[PDB]
């Protein structure tokens, strides 16, 4: 075998993470699984207008402001 260590393949600098982050226009509705995962109907901006889909809260780590706003106004 060869003995090599990992490289900094992932950037450590903060900047453009668009590849793993899309805009949250706002929440359109919500849902919860039986497995214990909560999901919301997100309108992702930056993408096509018809792209909106349900995503878990887990991906909404940045959209807590908008999500919690939703959950505040709607249960």
């Amino acid at each position: 075998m060869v003995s090599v260590k990992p490289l900094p393949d992932i950037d450590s600098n903060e900047g453009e993470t668009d590849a793993d982050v899309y805009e949250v226009e706002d929440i359109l509705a919500d849902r919860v699984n039986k497995n214990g995962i909560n999901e919301y109907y997100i309108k992702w901006a930056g993408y096509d207008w018809y792209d909106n889909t349900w995503e878990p809260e887990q991906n909404l780590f940045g959209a807590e402001k908008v999500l919690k706003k939703w959950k505040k106004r709607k249960k």
């Binding site: 899309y22 878990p56 991906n59 780590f61």
Partner: peptide, 18 residues
Amino acid sequence: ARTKQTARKSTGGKAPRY
């Protein structure tokens, strides 16, 4: 810029079926 929020979007997945 417009002050707005963003989130991941799990872009990728596979349904385990045969």
